[PDB]
Amino acid sequence: SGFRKMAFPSGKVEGCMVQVTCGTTTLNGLWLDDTVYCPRHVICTAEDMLNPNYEDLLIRKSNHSFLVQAGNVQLRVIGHSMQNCLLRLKVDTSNPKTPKYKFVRIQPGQTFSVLACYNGSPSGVYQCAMRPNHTIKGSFLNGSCGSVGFNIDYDCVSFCYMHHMELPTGVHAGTDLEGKFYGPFVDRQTAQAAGTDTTITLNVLAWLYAAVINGDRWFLNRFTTTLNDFNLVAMKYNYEPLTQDHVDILGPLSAQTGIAVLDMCAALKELLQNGMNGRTILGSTILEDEFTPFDVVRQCSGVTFQ
């Protein structure tokens, strides 16, 4: 029993972390096989972050303009290319610690684990969700960019996130591992701001199933709702609309507890209208939206405390 934000074990990612320096800028890269991956803004005059032209800035660099440091060993850079908002540095040594891995582009509402590093040395691991507005609520100081997010399926590390920047609200933005930003954001020092966010309804419902699986039923009710009438309420409380596909996804959790998904939505609807006051659900004073159904299945017993 218990339910905690739980991160994947970070071992296989840690063995891939290196330091990349260009000029006076130092940040982290991700050494897989013979390639290190990092934010292209490693090349940038921190004065022309204002309006960088990267193609133009990159052509001015050779191979030996970059230093890759893996522990106390220097890696020789023997090629380089820009892929969207990342650099692909070809080093002379394949990484012996290279896990089986996929690059994956994660979808809003999904979670991943973040291995925060500084100077190519890992300092901490935490969990977070891709918000609907394409930001993460991370914890990042300067020199953290190139820090990565990941999930682990079996022994296979699916990388989904590499860190580029912080926004005026103190939330975070970056790219997939092909260098494609999450959200409408760019790797220039300009006025950009997180869009309005919504609560992830799929996740809230899943976490309400988690509560029941662990043995709490206090928030349930003798009521059901149509999909559509749930959504008039969702909209008013700034929750994402529920879809039939979201209903489908909650299939197993609902089979495991015996609460029909629209029964749970009815209970959600009431939580939003009457509050919780005084009471908690899995410890929480509030309704939690950063656990997917997959995360609930992963961590709870496949047997309900009935």
Partner: peptide, 4 residues
């Protein structure tokens, strides 16, 4: 913006 703050590039970290």
């Amino acid at each position: 913006v703050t590039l970290x």
